Ligand binder design. Structure first.
Ligand code: MPG
Ligand code: MPG
Ligand code: VIB
Length: 197
């Protein structure tokens, strides 16, 4: 059962990373223009990181989905050049990540599950692009290479990097009200019990 503070902290994270998303979107446009779509595939997973952060921190159903929606909304508001369609891909990416936490009953937050969640967004956004972003015009080889790159980027820049960011925050103390903060507390109590006089 969600707490007010969790809903609130999830929003602040979404908002902050909306700014990051927008910066990378600008990069991606320049890259696409110069070298074609494959050029932004390596950084693609950054646009999923909010889902992993919110889920790993809060560990309740809907975190991955809602956090990404809010981040996409705010990125749109801040001036994403593609307008509201970024909110659609945001919804799609959030559903892709959420599906992995659904599949593991919102009880599993090991790195492999976080990476899978990232990859879920990779797959969902790739489906979206085949409908909307002109990907259907490309060859099997090009598409296959881009999907593979996007899958790796989702695993690394959302899953792994998302865990690293979250852990770093947990170490500041600011997540002490959250599941991840509680986990750190438990681990620290365990480690403290090794002290001897
Ligand atoms: C424990 C109570 C559960 C309440 C569920 C909260 C609502 C949000 C949960 C899941 C939203 C994602 C559903 C779509 C993922 C499967 C996509 C198909 O691929
Ligand atoms: C892993 C499974 C991932 C779960 C869900 C993602 C698949 C749904 C993609 C729908 C794309 C609709 C594409 O949306 C659209 O077509 C636009 O609204 C058109 O402007
Ligand atoms: C929240 C969010 N913001 C920006 C992107 C970037 N983006 C939207 S569409 C498109 C081209 C088709 O892949 C790219 C690079 C994203 N994926 N998710």
């Amino acid at each position: 059962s969600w707490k007010v503070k969790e809903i609130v902290i999830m929003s602040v994270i979404s908002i902050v990373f909306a700014v990051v998303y927008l910066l990378f979107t600008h990069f991606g446009n320049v890259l696409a223009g110069m070298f074609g779509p494959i050029a932004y595939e390596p950084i693609y997973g950054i646009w999923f990181i909010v889902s992993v952060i919110a889920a790993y921190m809060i560990r309740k159903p809907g975190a991955a989905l809602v956090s990404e929606i809010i981040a996409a909304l705010v990125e749109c508001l801040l001036g994403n050049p593609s307008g509201p369609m970024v909110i659609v891909i945001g919804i799609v990416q959030g559903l892709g990540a959420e599906a992995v936490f659904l599949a593991t009953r919102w009880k599993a937050y090991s790195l492999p599950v976080l990476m899978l969640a990232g990859m879920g967004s990779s797959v969902a956004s790739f489906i979206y692009d085949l409908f909307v972003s002109g990907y259907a015009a490309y060859s099997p080889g090009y598409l296959l290479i881009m999907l593979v790159i996007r899958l790796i980027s989702g695993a690394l820049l959302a899953g792994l990097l998302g865990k690293a960011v979250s852990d770093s925050l947990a170490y500041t103390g600011v997540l002490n009200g959250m599941a991840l903060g509680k986990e750190l507390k438990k681990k620290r109590k365990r480690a403290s019990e090794h002290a001897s006089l």
